RNA sequence: UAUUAAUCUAGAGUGUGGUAGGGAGUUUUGGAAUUUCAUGUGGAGCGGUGAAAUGCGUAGAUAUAUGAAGGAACACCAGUGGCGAAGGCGAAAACUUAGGCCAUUACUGACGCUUAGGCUUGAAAGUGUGGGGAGCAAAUAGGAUUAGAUACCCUAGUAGUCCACACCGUAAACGAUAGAUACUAGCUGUCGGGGCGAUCCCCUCGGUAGUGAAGUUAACACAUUAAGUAUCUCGCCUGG
RNA sequence: CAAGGAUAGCACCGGUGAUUGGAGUUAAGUCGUAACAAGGUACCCCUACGAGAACGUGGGGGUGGAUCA
């Protein structure tokens, strides 16, 4: 199931769109795979890099469970 | 070529001293000027970056330079008055085009159709209404200009035929 | 008309023609396009006359800018091609030539070899009769 | 990045040399210089060095043609084949 | 044709515009925490296997939480994904930049093609050079067990795994499938790009896949990304 | 002048020589079965060491292993 480029902006930073990123997120340091949200390569890049970036800036649990 | 620069500065510093820290950060910033101290609020960090549970968030929006942000990034890192020094460039993946960026208006239409404000249904992204058969549809085939047609007859329609008379 | 699927310089006209011929034989395809040349026009005309190959059409854009030839194989009404094997002889890496007195009849004395000589291009039999020899372009049977 | 348009238009003497030998060899030489700068600033980028050698070879062949066709290529030789 | 005298683009390609890859490198940090030290409490066990034991614990453990330090490597995203020349690329963030995908009668007018020789790179062990070395295992060493363990068990454990340099330059670097080039039923998937339009469906081209036609390997099977078709060049090949 | 005769330095090639690696060969020699089932430990490839030895372990490369949808 494609998620980005339909609810996203094709330009994903942390601010202004963090909720679409957190939709593949939990306070548990995990990202929903393609089996639940089958987003394409660029959308997977978006969610991966941006979510681990929010983890990197101390916005959401980096590894914390 | 634009820099969205996000600075998370120390703990729960008061707004005035946080702004002064930010001003020092431009003073050690060699990128393009025009950036103004925009307070994004005091946001709770997911973890203490060094010891600060919550940090003051700030954003700066302006252009970007090539060999002028590495030094700013590492100086802002070393400058302990600011904890976190994220950069964003103009190019992440999106379009620089007048026929793929204005397709974000179709994305706004998608936002409108995301919630069924009426009894009728136009929800469920990736629901084929099939409104488009046009587009390019062009591999640019080579146009043929006749030079010589050596016996223009060509055989065609080879039916399955054998031993037509068996009676 | 509209001639589709142009081909550029592969490495030579002869191999560009051979690959298309064998692909048409493989996929049971009717008509294929390749490069145009005086030798190619001569051999294609002589193969139309010989019966192994069906007709062909030589096309240009405006000039040497692009010159191609589309060619069809003679097929009975059973998807059976008249071409039972064609082998290129003239090659870049090997320029092959034979005298008029050293040209054989292919198949079982039936196949006709296409031979360009000092003063023209013709068939193997009339090349032997002409008393003039030269390069061979294609063994066709 | 590529450093494409400015170098092309500097080497673009007229509207009749957008893809000529002149602009091609100028692009290869400018890319050799830029790749040397980059790979000195970025050591272990073996992609850059292999591309630099490939461009050196293609520049050598472009120069051998440009001297085979036009005899004025070496009378104003600012692109000598030595690297 | 080898040569010469010119031109035309379509091969090399180049231009334009749109144009993406965990590409490489450079520069940063952030954490799961590993280990150690102090704060402590705890009051006889921890530990390891197929089985125990070896080993660790009463200068106060098992374990626990804080603070501090040093090293290592980055949970998920990870793809019938893309890119990188193979080697490979995944905690994120930036920069230089190779190269890429889409369509260009657009420009030199064959400038082409490869490749013995030649140029560069080349997992890695392991070598020494300077640091820390967090952890562990070649070697080594005890208890097992064994017909015996320096094999399978573990504890102790160095080279090394870490980084800077060379050299080692070999790999299952093998798709045991060379590079450049053009073509061959389809079908069902994906990614990227171009057009379009709530999304979307759709078309175009590639990339990335397959069953299978044809074709091709004895055979196993490949099969539009061939081991199918064909040109130039090279490397490998005749019994154990 | 000369066939030729020479010096000390060197250079090329051959055989030999206390002592000796390696190969094929005796249906009937020593240990254990490593390994061929996922073959008694899954195989290995490159490389370090050691072990009678099958081999065993390190750091990387792979499945030329099964399981399994």
Query: What residue ranges do the domains of chain A occupy?
Result: 1-65
Q: Enter the resolution in angstroms.
A: 15.0
The counts of H helices and E strands in chain C are 3, 8
Give the start-end residues of each E strand in chain B: 2-9, 38-44, 54-63, 82-86, 145-150
Q: Which of A31, A57, A60, A27 is nearest to A43 (CA)?
A: A31
- Whether the CB-CB separation of B76 and B7 falls below 8 Å is answered with yes
Distance (Å, rounded) from C-alpha B77 to C-alpha B50? Answer: 12
Q: Which SS3 state, helix, strand or coil, does residue B8 take? A: strand
Q: Do C78 and B158 touch (CB under 8 A)?
A: yes
- Whether the CB-CB separation of C90 and C135 falls below 8 Å is answered with yes
Distance (Å, rounded) from C-alpha C98 to C-alpha C136? Answer: 7
- Whether the CB-CB separation of C96 and C90 falls below 8 Å is answered with yes
Q: Do C78 and B162 touch (CB under 8 A)?
A: yes
Distance (Å, rounded) from C-alpha C122 to C-alpha C137? Answer: 10
Distance (Å, rounded) from C-alpha A52 to C-alpha A14? Answer: 10
The count of domains in chain D is 1
Whether chain A lies against chain C with 3 or more Cβ pairs closer than 8 A is: no
Distance (Å, rounded) from C-alpha A19 to C-alpha B111? Answer: 14
B68 CA vs E95 C1’ separation (Å)? 8
Distance (Å, rounded) from C-alpha A48 to C-alpha B4? Answer: 19
Pairing mode, strands C97-98 and C53-60: unpaired
Question: Residue C7: left (phi > 0), alpha (psi -120 to 50), or beta?
Answer: beta
Give residue D76's domain range: 1-83
Distance (Å, rounded) from C-alpha B146 to C-alpha C2? Answer: 9
Distance (Å, rounded) from C-alpha C84 to C-alpha C121? Answer: 22
- Residue B62 corresponds to which tokens in the numbers above? 């302006």
Residues whose CB falls within 8 Å of the CB of residue B51, separated by 6 or more in sequence, listed in order: B11
Give the start-end residues of each E strand in B64-139: 82-86
Distance (Å, rounded) from C-alpha C80 to C-alpha C70? Answer: 19
- Residue A41 corresponds to which tokens in the numbers above? 């390569």
Q: Which SS3 state, helix, strand or coil, does residue C126 take? A: helix
Q: Do A58 and B104 touch (CB under 8 A)?
A: no
Location of structure tokens 């190959």: C53
Q: Which of A5, A9, A13 is nearest to A49 (CA)?
A: A13
Total Cβ atoms within 10 A of residue B103:
12
- Whether the CB-CB separation of D17 and D23 falls below 8 Å is answered with yes
- The burial class, CB within 10 Å (0-12 / 13-18 / 19+), for B166 is exposed
Question: Residue C73: left (phi > 0), alpha (psi -120 to 50), or beta?
Answer: beta
Q: Do C72 and B144 touch (CB under 8 A)?
A: no
Q: Which SS3 state, helix, strand or coil, does residue C18 take? A: helix
- Whether the CB-CB separation of D3 and D34 falls below 8 Å is answered with yes
Q: Please check whether strand E approaches the CB of D80 to within 7 Å.
A: no
- Whether the CB-CB separation of A55 and A17 falls below 8 Å is answered with no
Distance (Å, rounded) from C-alpha A46 to C-alpha A27? Answer: 18
Query: Which chain C residue has its CA at the smallest distance from B142's CA?
Result: C4
Helix axis angle for C38-50 and C13-27, nearest 10°, is 40
- Whether the CB-CB separation of A28 and A62 falls below 8 Å is answered with no
Distance (Å, rounded) from C-alpha C56 to C-alpha B148? Answer: 9
Strand E positions within 7 A of protein Cβ atoms:
1, 7-33, 67-68, 75-82, 84-87, 91-99, 103-113, 119-122, 165, 180-185, 190-205, 213-215, 224, 228-233
Across C37-70, b (16+ Cβ under 10 Å) vs e yields bebbbbbbbbbbeeebbbbbbbbbeeeeeebbbb
Helix axis angle for D46-69 and D21-41, nearest 10°, is 160
């Amino acid at each position: 199931y494609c998620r980005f480029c339909a609810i996203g902006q094709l330009r994903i930073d942390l601010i202004d769109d963090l909720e679409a990123l957190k939709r593949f997120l939990s306070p548990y340091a995990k990202i929903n795979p393609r089996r639940i949200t089958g987003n394409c390569q660029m959308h997977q890049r978006h969610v991966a890099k941006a979510l681990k970036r929010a983890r990197y800036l101390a916005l959401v649990p980096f590894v914390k469970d | 070529m634009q820099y969205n620069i996000i600075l998370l500065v120390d703990g729960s510093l008061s707004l005035e001293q946080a702004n002064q820290v930010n001003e020092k950060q431009q003073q050690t910033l060699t990128n393009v000027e025009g950036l103004q101290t925009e307070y994004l609020g005091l946001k709770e960090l997911a973890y203490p970056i060094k010891k600060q549970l919550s940090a003051h968030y700030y954003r700066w929006k302006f252009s970007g330079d090539n060999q002028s942000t590495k030094d700013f990034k590492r100086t802002a890192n070393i400058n302990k008055q600011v904890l976190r020094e994220l950069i964003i460039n103009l190019e992440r993946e999106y379009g620089y085009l007048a026929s793929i960026n204005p397709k974000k208006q179709q994305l706004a239409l998608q936002k409108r159709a995301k919630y069924d404000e009426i009894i009728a249904r136009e929800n469920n992204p990736e629901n084929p209404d099939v409104p488009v058969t046009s587009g390019l549809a062009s591999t640019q085939p080579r146009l043929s200009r006749t030079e010589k047609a050596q016996k223009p007859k060509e055989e065609l329609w080879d039916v399955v035929q054998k031993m037509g008379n068996f009676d | 008309i509209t001639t589709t699927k142009p081909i550029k310089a592969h490495f030579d006209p002869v191999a560009d023609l051979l690959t298309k011929i064998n692909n048409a034989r493989k996929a049971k395809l009717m008509t294929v396009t390749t490069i145009a040349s005086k030798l190619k026009i001569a051999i294609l005309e002589i193969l139309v006359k010989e019966g192994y190959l069906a007709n062909f059409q030589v096309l240009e854009n405006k000039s040497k800018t692009k010159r191609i030839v589309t060619f069809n194989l003679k097929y009975t009404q059973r998807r059976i091609p008249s071409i039972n094997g064609v082998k290129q002889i003239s090659k870049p890496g090997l320029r092959i030539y034979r005298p008029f007195e050293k040209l054989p009849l292919v198949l079982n004395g039936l196949g006709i070899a296409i031979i360009s000589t000092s003063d023209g291009v013709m068939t193997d039999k009339v090349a032997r009769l002409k008393k003039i020899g030269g390069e061979i372009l294609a063994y066709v049977w | 990045q590529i450093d494409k348009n400015g170098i092309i238009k500097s080497a673009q003497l007229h509207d009749k040399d957008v893809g000529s030998i002149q602009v091609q060899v100028s692009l290869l030489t400018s890319q050799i210089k830029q790749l040397t700068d980059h790979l000195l600033a970025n050591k272990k980028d073996f992609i850059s060095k292999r591309g630099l050698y490939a461009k050196v070879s293609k520049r050598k062949r472009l120069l051998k043609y440009l001297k085979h066709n036009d005899l004025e290529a070496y009378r104003n030789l600012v692109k000598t084949l030595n690297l």
